[PDB]
Write a protein that binds this ligand. Structure first.
Ligand SMILES: CNC(=O)c1ccc2c(NC(=O)Cc3cccc(Cl)c3)cncc2c1
Ligand SMILES: CNC(=O)c1ccc2c(NC(=O)Cc3cccc(Cl)c3)cncc2c1
Ligand SMILES: [Cl-]
Lengths: 305, 298
């Protein structure tokens, strides 16, 4: 019993964190095999950020301009290349602590663990989700750039995010491990703002199924809804449209609890209309959207209370 | 910016988790040097009588894909200490520490010696922890990190009828009035950790959330008279002293922040949130707030 926001054990990722210095800038790198991956803005000054020509700044750099530090050991850089918004530093030593890994690009709604680092040293781990507006509501300070997001399924680390910047509203933006940004963001100091954010509906529903599995059913009702009628009400509360794919994905949770997806949709409609009336669901007074249907199956028991 | 419930990196602890089997029971062990620590209920009650009938080979210890050979065994309170033939090469710098209610820690939840997740939680005033555990999680550990030293503070033993969790320190002494057997045991009435709610209000002010601030102050006595009515733990002068650095950074005196909490307790949030929460959060200590808003690394 119990339902917590749970992160993956960070050990396999801690063994890959290094410190990258270029001139006066210092941020984090991910050392996998003989390559260190880090945000390409490490080659920039604060001035360059207004309109940076990265190709021009990079052509003026040599290998010895990049200082890479793994614990108390200096790594020798033997090559460098740029792939989209990530700088790839070829080093002389392969990381002996390199785990089994894949680079994966996630979709909004997907969750992941973040290992927040400063100066190549990991300071904490937390769970978060890729928001519908492609931002992440993380907890980051200056020097955290290059911190990574990941999932560990079986013995393989799936790297999905690298931290690049903080937006004016305090939310964060970054890239996949191939340097492609999530969202309409650029590694440029420009007037770019996060779009209006929405609630991840399929995740709220999964979290309601988790509450039913943990013995709480106060929010259920005798009503059902059409998928179209649910979406007309959901849009009014800034909820993401629920698609037929989302309904299909919720199938196993519906089977385990005996509550059809459109029947659970009718409870969500009522929760949006009435609020919680002094009650909580899984110790929360708000509707939680940072647990996927897969996270619920992973964490919760296979037998309903 | 951003405020998350953050756990310590679990790497130093993952390298210590092993699987312990005794007959038909399977749970987790903590392998430090040549000793494996695990709940004594793995032998399940007169524990000395059940233990005297056991031999070393009755305990199967598995570290990854390698079998460890048990060469001795002894009991210390509610923890079983299995002397093994191999010292753990991944043993970090560590201490065994007993925490106080209100203090927080990271939990590395394990099943069959394999770590599955990490989360942050607090020792409640009623000595229970609101964790997330399933069958096979016994022996999962709680910890903090100070520089490079892992401070082990909790070992999971059982789940109570309300879904909350109970366990011991690493010397086998339970937190709370609990015993390790199948009997009628209930968690006492819980209270809100007041010093932690205040720290979380200071964290909100640091992150630019000040709607709950007012021009008023309160005496420590008047605050405690109101706090006792809402099932809040009494705020002591020590708690006020501990909140000193957060008061200095924000310019808001502790008894001034207490007047804001008094207003939230009497009138609610009125459709508003603090750090994305519609409830007052008590599982962040004053030190956790300072650490998350400073960038302390391990
Ligand atoms: C209290 N928080 C802060 O003051 C703060 C300051 C800075 C933070 C930060 N840094 C940047 O954004 C660097 C940069 C500037 C312009 C463009 C790009 Cl692509 C990168 C990252 N993550 C978090 C931060 C947090
Ligand atoms: C789906 N999970 C469960 O049903 C479940 C079952 C059991 C859980 C558990 N184990 C126990 O309490 C076993 C025990 C019984 C009597 C005395 C003692 Cl000291 C220990 C711990 N933590 C979580 C659990 C969760
Ligand atoms: Cl995805």
């Amino acid at each position: 019993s119990g339902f917590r926001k749970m992160a993956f054990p960070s050990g396999k990722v801690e063994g890959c964190m290094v410190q990258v210095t270029c001139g006066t800038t210092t941020l984090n790198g991910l050392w996998l095999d003989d390559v260190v991956y880090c945000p390409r803005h490490v080659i920039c000054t604060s001035e360059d950020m207004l309109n940076p020509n990265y190709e021009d700044l990079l052509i003026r750099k040599s290998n010895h301009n990049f200082l890479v530090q793994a614990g108390n050991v200096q790594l020798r850089v033997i090559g460098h290349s740029m792939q989209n918004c990530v700088l790839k530093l070829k080093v002389d030593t392969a990381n002996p602590k390199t785990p089994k890994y894949k680079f994966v690009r996630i979709q909004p709604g997907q969750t992941f663990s973040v290992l927040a680092c400063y100066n190549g040293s990991p300071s904490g781990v937390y769970q978060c989700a890729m928001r519908p507006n492609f931002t992440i509501k993380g907890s980051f300070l200056n020097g955290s750039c290059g911190s990574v997001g990941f999932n560990i399924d079986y013995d393989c680390v799936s790297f999905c995010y690298m931290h690049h910047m903080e937006l004016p509203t305090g939310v964060h933006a970054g890239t996949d491990l191939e340097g492609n940004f999530y969202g309409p963001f650029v590694d440029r100091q420009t007037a770019q703002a996060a779009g209006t954010d929405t609630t991840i509906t399929v995740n709220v529903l999964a979290w309601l199924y988790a509450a039913v599995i943990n013995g709480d059913r106060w929010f259920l009702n005798r009503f059902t809804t059409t998928l179209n009628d649910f979406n007309l009400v959901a849009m009014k509360y800034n909820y993401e449209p629920l698609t037929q794919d989302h309904v299909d994905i919720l199938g196993p949770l519906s089977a385990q609890t005996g509550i059809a997806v459109l029947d659970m949709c009718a409870s969500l409609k009522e929760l949006l209309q009435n609020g919680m009336n002094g009650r909580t669901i899984l110790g929360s007074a708000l509707l939680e959207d940072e647990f996927t249907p897969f996270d619920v199956v992973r964490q919760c028991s296979g037998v309903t209370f």
